[PDB]
Design a protein around this nucleic acid. Structure first.
Ligand code: MG
Ligand code: MG
Ligand code: MG
Ligand code: MG
Ligand code: MG
Ligand code: MG
Ligand code: MG
Ligand code: MG
Ligand code: MG
Ligand code: MG
Ligand code: MG
Ligand code: MG
Ligand code: MG
Ligand code: MG
Ligand code: MG
Ligand code: MG
Ligand code: MG
Ligand code: MG
Ligand code: MG
Ligand code: MG
Ligand code: MG
Ligand code: MG
Ligand code: MG
Ligand code: MG
Ligand code: MG
Ligand code: MG
Ligand code: MG
Ligand code: MG
Ligand code: MG
Ligand code: MG
Ligand code: MG
Ligand code: MG
Ligand code: MG
Ligand code: MG
Ligand code: MG
Lengths: 152, 55, 117
RNA sequence: CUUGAGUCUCGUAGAGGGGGGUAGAAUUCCAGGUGUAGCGGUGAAAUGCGUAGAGAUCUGGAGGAAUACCGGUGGCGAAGGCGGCCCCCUGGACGAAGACUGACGCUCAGGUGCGAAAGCGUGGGGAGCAAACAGGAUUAGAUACCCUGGUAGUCCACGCCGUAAACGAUGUCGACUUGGAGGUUGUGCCGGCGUGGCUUCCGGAGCUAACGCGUUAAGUCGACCGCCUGGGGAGUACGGCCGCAAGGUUAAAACUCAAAUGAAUUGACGGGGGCCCGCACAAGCGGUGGAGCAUGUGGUUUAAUUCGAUGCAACGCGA
RNA sequence: GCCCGGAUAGCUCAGGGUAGAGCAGGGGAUUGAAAAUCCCCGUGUCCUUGGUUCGAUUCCGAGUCCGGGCACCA
RNA sequence: UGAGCCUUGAUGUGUAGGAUAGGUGGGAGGCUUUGAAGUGUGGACGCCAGUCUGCAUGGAGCCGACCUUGAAAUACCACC
């Protein structure tokens, strides 16, 4: 805000994996404060992804995540009434947050049966570069590189 | 603003020397000053205004 | 088509566009490129990025002549005065001389009236 | 009679004026070589130019206008004004020592002369710029601001015109009255010491409604001239004089209002400047506006649909 | 009547081993707006038919239509 | 500087595949110290994968039918 005094809120870790990343993934997935439901959904999705990929739950998740992280975004800046689209770098924490938000949003728009099935299919598609999340990442990248002249 | 590069110096130092030579030559100032016609009354007005503001 | 091995680059930079031409010492053009001809239309046409893109494209277009030495004369006050020469050097030429050759009247004719914006 | 006023001897500085010549940079046009798909313009565009070869680049030629740097609240002139270099003609100012005339002085109604720019007549000239005009935009409209073109004019010779916020909004001449910091230009004595002319800034007494002026007075006095008498009507009508014309100069009356005005003070406002704060923006999450129902209100209906709140700060409000 | 060239997307259109470039229109990043950008999307016997060829939008014949120069014009 | 006209030398990897092999063809012998496999090196062309090309060193081998193709190997040769 106007003060630059805010702090960082600590987060409880994953029970059976001990990864803060999956806890934040559950938090992003969680709606209405029902955290047990989100934990069950994410655990089922990770289990089916691990069995259908064979590596494990963890590095398969990270590999799927890395295909969605962006490295440059676009910010509007007003100069003379007309707004320039300046390309700016993205902090790694913002990269993780954007990737998980995109993955969950893409999962919610699918015609599959259960939420875990949608999440598993989307996560595998991202892991092998065919989901809509990678499409959104490519859209952002192309829009950012199009306005490369405004990058002072 | 004629810069003849000497022996083995890098490109950056020659470019900086050329920029400095163009800065001390008042090239862009003259170019911007001759873009539009400014009346003699405005010339005297702003010259005197600069003089009094300095003092 | 011919080997000259040493030419001069003319950069014509204004507030709206930059034009780069390559010629031999006698003053016969070999190739040219422009910021507006490189897919930059409008405000984007008047930026240093477009100027250095045009510089790279013009350097590419004159490949068949085997240029190894190059002088530079730059005229005009435009934003693309320094990006172009940097891009031209990075393309592999040797900038052996830099000159500003912008015209300046020694009085001259009456400039247009001022814009009331 | 010599102190006011003027003449003579030597010198200094200066965009002071009239005439003629010449130089360099740049814009425009003309012819030619290289070379190829854009150029130009804007907040964004479009009109406009270009494959009949533009824009870019190089060579040669024609023509007109103005003189970058020096350049400076620097200089010259009564004012208006005056800026490359060179020659011819010419006006004034100041300085040092001496000589000469002997009140020859100051101001000035009527009169006469000069007087930016625009404008008018005749004859040339025309690169750049640019009223009028045409087209493209923006806009609710745009007879404008912005863009592309573009004719009188701007330039020269002669002749009219006689007006400007022609302003220091401060008539000319003379004498007297504490200081400080500079600029420019002469001169005497030994970098120091003095002494004249013009000029910029601050400030004391004094003056002023205040702002402010302050030895270059808006301080204290003397001589002469011009001008003012509430605001509109009106610097207008009629008459005279001047002009080719546009118009200039002198200059009222009826009627109407109780004010019009100057300087400064306290706030408020600014599509003025500086510094800050708030789920005020920016980052996120969940909603309302669509559907069904509950409830309040407006409106319409009724014998009555009781009364009040009814921009934010009334409408699941008094209840 | 003859000769000369053409038939390709919704439009304009180049092209013996393929169907191609731009804009039109639709949605969304997108902002109050045209901008302006990004993203895709289709948009096809390459006029019809027949004929060679390992298959022809391509080469060949006959037809439908457009344009040009001619000829008949008693 | 245009148009036709001969002669030469190149030029032509849909997909097979050692092979940047067009229609056609008498037809597996030419080539070879008339210095030849393979070379350093000059150079051309190029859907840049590969075709063409002088000299030098070097010294005398490549080689036709062979399996994939619609076809063989510019082994000479001729028709476009
Ligand atoms: Mg202009
Ligand atoms: Mg003089
Ligand atoms: Mg003079
Ligand atoms: Mg030319
Ligand atoms: Mg003076
Ligand atoms: Mg004199
Ligand atoms: Mg004189
Ligand atoms: Mg006497
Ligand atoms: Mg007098
Ligand atoms: Mg008089
Ligand atoms: Mg005049
Ligand atoms: Mg006139
Ligand atoms: Mg005239
Ligand atoms: Mg005339
Ligand atoms: Mg013009
Ligand atoms: Mg108009
Ligand atoms: Mg007057
Ligand atoms: Mg004046
Ligand atoms: Mg006055
Ligand atoms: Mg006095
Ligand atoms: Mg004072
Ligand atoms: Mg007074
Ligand atoms: Mg006085
Ligand atoms: Mg006085
Ligand atoms: Mg009058
Ligand atoms: Mg009269
Ligand atoms: Mg007042
Ligand atoms: Mg204020
Ligand atoms: Mg304020
Ligand atoms: Mg917000
Ligand atoms: Mg509702
Ligand atoms: Mg009520
Ligand atoms: Mg009541
Ligand atoms: Mg009421
Ligand atoms: Mg309530």
């Amino acid at each position: 805000p106007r003060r630059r005094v805010i702090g960082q809120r600590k987060i409880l870790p994953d029970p059976k994996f001990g990864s803060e990343l999956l806890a934040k993934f559950v938090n992003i997935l969680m709606v209405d404060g029902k955290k047990s439901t989100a934990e069950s959904i994410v655990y089922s999705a990770l289990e089916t992804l691990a069995q259908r990929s064979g590596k494990s739950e963890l590095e398969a998740f990270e590999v799927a995540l890395e295909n969605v992280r962006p490295t440059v975004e676009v910010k509007s800046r007003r100069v003379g009434g007309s707004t320039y689209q300046v390309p700016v770098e993205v902090r790694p924490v913002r990269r993780n947050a954007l990737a998980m938000r995109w993955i969950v949003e893409a999962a919610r728009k699918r015609g599959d049966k259960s939420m875990a099935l949608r999440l598993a299919n989307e996560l595998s598609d991202a892991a092998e570069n065919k989901g809509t999340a990678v499409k959104k990442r490519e859209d952002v990248h192309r829009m950012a590189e199009a306005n490369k002249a405004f990058a002072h | 603003p004629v810069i003849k590069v000497r022996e083995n110096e890098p490109f950056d130092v020659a470019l900086r020397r050329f920029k400095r030579s163009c800065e001390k030559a008042g090239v862009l100032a003259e170019v911007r000053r001759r873009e539009f016609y400014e009346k003699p009354t405005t010339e005297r007005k702003r010259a005197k205004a600069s003089a009094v503001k300095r003092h | 088509r011919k080997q000259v091995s040493d030419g001069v680059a003319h950069i014509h930079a204004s507030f709206n566009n930059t034009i780069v031409t390559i010629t031999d010492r006698q003053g016969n053009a070999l190739g040219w490129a422009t910021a507006g001809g490189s897919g930059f239309r409008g405000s984007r046409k008047s930026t240093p990025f477009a100027a250095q893109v045009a510089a790279e494209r013009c350097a590419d277009a004159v490949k068949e002549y085997g240029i190894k030495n190059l002088e530079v004369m730059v005229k005009g006050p435009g934003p693309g005065r320094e990006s172009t020469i940097r891009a031209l050097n990075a393309a592999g030429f040797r900038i052996t001389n830099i000159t500003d050759v912008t015209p300046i009247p020694h009085x001259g004719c009456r400039p247009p009236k001022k814009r009331r914006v």
